Amino acid sequence: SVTEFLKPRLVDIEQVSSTHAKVTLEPLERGFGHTLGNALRRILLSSMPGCAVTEVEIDGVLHEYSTKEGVQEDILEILLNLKGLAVRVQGKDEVILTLNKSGIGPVTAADITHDGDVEIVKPQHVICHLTDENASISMRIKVQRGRGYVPASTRILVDACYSPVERIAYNVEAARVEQRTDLDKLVIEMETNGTIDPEEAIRRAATILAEQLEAFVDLRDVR
Amino acid sequence: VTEFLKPRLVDIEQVSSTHAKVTLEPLERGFGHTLGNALRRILLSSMPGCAVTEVEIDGVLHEYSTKEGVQEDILEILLNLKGLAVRVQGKDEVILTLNKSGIGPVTAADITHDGDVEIVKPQHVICHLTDENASISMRIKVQRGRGYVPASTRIHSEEDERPIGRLLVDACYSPVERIAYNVEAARVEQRTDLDKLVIEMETNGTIDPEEAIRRAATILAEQLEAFVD
Amino acid sequence: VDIVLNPLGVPSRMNIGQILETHLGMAAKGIGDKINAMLKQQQEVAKLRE
Amino acid sequence: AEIKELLKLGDLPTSGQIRLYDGRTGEQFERPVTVGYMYMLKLNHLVDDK
Amino acid sequence: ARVTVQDAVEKIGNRFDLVLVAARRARQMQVGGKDPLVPEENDKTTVIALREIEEGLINNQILDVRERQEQQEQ
Amino acid sequence: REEAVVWDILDEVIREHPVLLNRAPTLHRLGIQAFEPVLIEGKAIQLHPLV
Amino acid sequence: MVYSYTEKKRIRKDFGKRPQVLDVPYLLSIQLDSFQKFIEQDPEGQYGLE
Amino acid sequence: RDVHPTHYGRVCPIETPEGPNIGLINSLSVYAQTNEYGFLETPYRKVTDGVVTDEIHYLSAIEEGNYVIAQANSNLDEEGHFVEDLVTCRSKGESSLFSRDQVDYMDVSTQQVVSVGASLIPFLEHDDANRALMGANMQRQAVPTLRADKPLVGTGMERAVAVDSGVTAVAKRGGVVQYVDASRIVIKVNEDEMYPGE
Amino acid sequence: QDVVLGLYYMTRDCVNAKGEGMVLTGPKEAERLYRSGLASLHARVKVRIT
Amino acid sequence: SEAEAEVAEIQEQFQSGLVTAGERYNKVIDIWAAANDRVSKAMMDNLQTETVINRDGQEEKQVSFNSIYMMADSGARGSAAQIRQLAGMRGLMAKPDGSIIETPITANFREGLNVLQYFISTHGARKGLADTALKTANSGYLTRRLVDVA
């Protein structure tokens, strides 16, 4: 292995729930676990493509300090409750959706018009607060797909959480093969937003990196 | 991918024979510096280089002494020869024989130079002897290694062997030992902004900058392959 | 990095000698670096003397 | 002040302050650090005998 | 293994018999004839004894009652 | 012979039994403590800055 | 400019502004003079053997 | 074990034992001269008529209380004259701003106070004193390594220190080094240096 | 040790850095703080507290 | 300089005989203490959170990041007393065995120290070290008696 050592064999990953998980790797080489963990973190953070909500055109005052008007849902309140909803587009571009119903107050993610391409990971996700009347209003929001994530202040709008990621970090552990214990094995604990299998995320990230490994030396193989 | 803009190593200028300045095409940020750091780690880690493995010198047999005409100690001569650098052929474990006499300055030319061995600094100092009657003659086996090792590490491997006369020393076996990974945002105009990376390798001359870079990248890719599982 | 010193100690010691040594040693190592760069470039002996 | 001027002459920061890129994540650490060639010595007591 | 020992102190209160109960259960388990009521996880026998005690199944009265029942059944 | 399996068996034994250590001066009950020992292969036992 | 034939290869840049007037003492004659007197063949009996 | 009032320039100031035997360790300064019967006389330049005379007198304790000895940090004219007439001058253990004519003898040197142990450390004016003494105690416990390089910094006495140690070999009346072997140094001195019959 | 110093550096601002007025929810605060967009040296970074 | 002028006035008064040795000494001590307090206040001001930073008003007098100041604000090691000696005078700092010397200490680690400055300062540290050394035994004997009682 010309100091090629080996690759962590055991890849056991423990998921406490669908939104939180932890993964452990077998012995990787000294520094190799740490360098690889940092690289994977920088990639999965600096690049996590996906679909999410971008901007809305709600009826009423366009000022940030607007009035709920009996809806009891502040503009920021509804904006945060919706910007966290993982509305995913199947294969299309940005998809705009609008909703209008009575004054029940119960904000679920199933109230809007169900588009074929647009899908939401949580159909009961709250988008706003309970109202105090029986009126209707139009949201006129759009859901877009993008690589990584984008700021919303510069891109006018609420929060561009195209990355469906919540928590992830790389821990480093040590172990011996027989007696040589200076082995850098990386450990990853990651709590995820959802709509993405963590194994699927790892495989996709590895595939993207390998496709880029085809740059320069192009991960040259040999006999 | 989504317009990945895959880069390519280019403008590879060999700054020296044991150093080089190699660039590459632009790529998206957040990984380019990380890619460079990982490459520096892997090449620095899995650095297979030709070094000196075992030695045998006629006058100096066992440990540490001084002989008439001699200048530097057994370990001091060990460092002085280690002051020179060795590049081997595909087969490692080559054996060099440094034999000389006279009063002239010590240079790397007066060693057993064969087809499996390359000597770069033919002006490496080996503590020129002061006596004409003095006649240096040491035969040393030089091997390619990948990483550092203790000198006591090989104790059990040769229990009966390595007797008084046979010499073994510790080593580092790091072919490069000098490489910096600098990521700069450049070389992207038509597509989205991307970072142009320049790599300034500095090795011991055992391996070419491009070949070693390719080897490190292949190792990194192979490691990332396990990440799929 | 080569050797990392825990910064929290130095103010308690009230010994700037660490700081003075750092500055002076940086100066000496840099001057030696310039001299070595000149030698690698094989600059003029009179120029190096100047 | 002569030390600062010498650092400037040696193409070194006069106060010596200099940023760095991390070795574990490459992150540019804040507080650009002033450093240099600082000496260290050994003690008559040694690890193995203890 | 366990990092902190507080639940045993709460179940005991006197903070003195808890270690004694753990040692007594561990000695019996190591000598043999006893089965851990809690699922084992390749830990020390004292660790299993302390875990069973903190679970609310091993005490100084249950152990005595079990010993008396075993002696009377001979 | 010091087999690696010997190291493994020692590790298994240690995983069941922690160790106790104390400080140089004898001042208070704070100098001696019990915590989960682990082989360090270092020359001096390393303690978390906790104690 | 100190000739310093021995130091003609090794000369440390100075930082002592005060022009030194008194050179370092022998610092080795401390017991040396004592022993020399103790073994001095004094013509008169005043010290040492005499 | 306290600071001896008449030992300002006789004993090593910061060099003393760091254990139970503290204070019992002292060392003469760089220019410490001895007295006649059983004492030591610290060298001290003359200070007469503004000009701080280079004439240095080894000064013992008893006579020191009479003459006024100036501080080392004396900015003196080229003729030796004191630049500042109001100069803190010590005559009998109470240094105070004394007239240019109020100092009877001139100091020896700035380092003429401490011993060789302090001399290696420079920039010491920016140091903590307890830390300074602790380090001066600490410096002794070093032992030679495989490779010996002079530290980047210098204090000026290292070459003189190497000379005074007497571990190297001095070219005691030598002219040219001819046949120097790993242990056999044959050195030929010039005929003038070649003493007759040698 | 400086652990509390690190916390204080976390829970304090120089005066107000770039984007000192950033308002968000908190889930990605680690990402922005580590990379860019916000720093402890910035004051009054609005944050939905729960 | 103002403190020096006041001390010179006190010395003149003593020479005229108006102020006795004790009276002149007390006056000079008060003058030096006032100067030390004023210097402490001035150094604190020059070293408190006294820094101008860019802002909307272009004047952000807030917490600086000076190493001494930041360390003291954290309070993990050292305090402003150390900065008092490092940047200015350490105070009087005169005690061979018990008493107070004639000339005072006016110097800084950032400005060096007098030859006699450390020399007068020398006796205190040695005395304190020897004191701790000897006092360990008495404390041990006392605690031994205590434990015997216990």
Swiss-Prot record, chain A:
Effect on the protein of changing residue 176 to C: In rpoA101; temperature-sensitive
E.C. number: 2.7.7.6
Region of interest (Alpha N-terminal domain (alpha-NTD)), ranges: 1-220
Keyword set includes Endoplasmic reticulum: no
PTM comment, free text: (Microbial infection) ADP-ribosylated on both alpha subunits by the phage T4 protein ModA. ADP-ribosylated on only one of the alpha subunits by the phage T4 protein Alt.
Enzyme class: transferase
GO biological process: bacterial-type flagellum assembly; bacterial-type flagellum-dependent cell motility; cell motility; cellular response to cell envelope stress; DNA-templated transcription initiation; intracellular iron ion homeostasis; nitrate assimilation; regulation of DNA-templated transcription elongation
Keyword Cell division: no
CC per GO annotation: cytoplasm; cytosol; cytosolic DNA-directed RNA polymerase complex; membrane; transcription elongation factor complex
A single GO molecular function term of this UniProt record: DNA-directed RNA polymerase activity
Reactions performed catalytically: RNA(n) + a ribonucleoside 5'-triphosphate = RNA(n+1) + diphosphate
Keywords: Acetylation, ADP-ribosylation, DNA-directed RNA polymerase, Nucleotidyltransferase, Transcription, Transferase
Swiss-Prot/TrEMBL domain comment: The N-terminal domain is essential for RNAP assembly and basal transcription, whereas the C-terminal domain is involved in interaction with transcriptional regulators (such as CRP) and with upstream promoter elements.
Family assignment from sequence similarity: Belongs to the RNA polymerase alpha chain family.
Protein's UniProt name: DNA-directed RNA polymerase subunit alpha
Protein species of origin: Escherichia coli (strain K12)
Gene: rpoA
From Swiss-Prot, chain C:
Modifications after synthesis and translation: Acetylated on several lysine residues in the presence of glucose.
Biotechnological applications listed in the UniProt record: Co-administration of salinamide and rifampicin or salinamide and myxopyronin suppresses the emergence of resistance to both antibiotics.
Assembly notes: The RNAP catalytic core consists of 2 alpha, 1 beta, 1 beta' and 1 omega subunit. When a sigma factor is associated with the core the holoenzyme is formed, which can initiate transcription. The rRNA transcription and antitermination complex (rrnTAC) consists of RNAP, NusA, NusB, NusE (rpsJ), NusG, SubB, ribosomal protein S4, DNA and precursor rRNA; S4 is more flexible than other subunits. In pull-down experiments interacts with CedA.
Protein family membership: Belongs to the RNA polymerase beta chain family.
Function of the molecule: DNA-dependent RNA polymerase (RNAP) catalyzes the transcription of DNA into RNA using the four ribonucleoside triphosphates as substrates. Resistance to the antibiotics salinamide A, salinamide B, rifampicin, streptolydigin, CBR703, myxopyronin, and lipiarmycin can result from mutations in this protein.
Name of this chain's protein: DNA-directed RNA polymerase subunit beta
Source organism (scientific name): Escherichia coli (strain K12)
Swiss-Prot record, chain D:
Reported biotechnological use: Co-administration of salinamide and rifampicin or salinamide and myxopyronin suppresses the emergence of resistance to both antibiotics.
Disulfide bridge map: none
N6-acetyllysine: residues bearing it: 8
Modified how: Acetylated on several lysine residues in the presence of glucose.
Similarity field: Belongs to the RNA polymerase beta chain family.
Function description: DNA-dependent RNA polymerase (RNAP) catalyzes the transcription of DNA into RNA using the four ribonucleoside triphosphates as substrates.
Subunit record text: The RNAP catalytic core consists of 2 alpha, 1 beta, 1 beta' and 1 omega subunit. When a sigma factor is associated with the core the holoenzyme is formed, which can initiate transcription. The rRNA transcription and antitermination complex (rrnTAC) consists of RNAP, NusA, NusB, NusE (rpsJ), NusG, SubB, ribosomal protein S4, DNA and precursor rRNA; S4 is more flexible than other subunits. In pull-down experiments interacts with CedA.
Name the UniProt record assigns to this protein: DNA-directed RNA polymerase subunit beta
Lineage, opening ranks: Bacteria, Pseudomonadati, Pseudomonadota, Gammaproteobacteria, Enterobacterales
Gene: rpoB
Residue range from the parent sequence: 1193 to 1242 of 1342
Curated annotation (Swiss-Prot), chain I:
Biotech uses: Co-administration of salinamide and rifampicin or salinamide and myxopyronin suppresses the emergence of resistance to both antibiotics.
Post-translational modification as stated in the protein's UniProt record: Acetylated on several lysine residues in the presence of glucose.
Family designation: Belongs to the RNA polymerase beta' chain family.
Subunit (UniProt): The RNAP catalytic core consists of 2 alpha, 1 beta, 1 beta' and 1 omega subunit. When a sigma factor is associated with the core the holoenzyme is formed, which can initiate transcription. The rRNA transcription and antitermination complex (rrnTAC) consists of RNAP, NusA, NusB, NusE (rpsJ), NusG, SubB, ribosomal protein S4, DNA and precursor rRNA; S4 is more flexible than other subunits.
Function comment: DNA-dependent RNA polymerase (RNAP) catalyzes the transcription of DNA into RNA using the four ribonucleoside triphosphates as substrates. Resistance to the antibiotics salinamide A, salinamide B, rifampicin, streptolydigin, CBR703, myxopyronin, and lipiarmycin can result from mutations in this protein.
Protein name: DNA-directed RNA polymerase subunit beta'
Gene giving rise to this polypeptide: rpoC
Location of this fragment in the whole protein: 504 to 553 of 1407
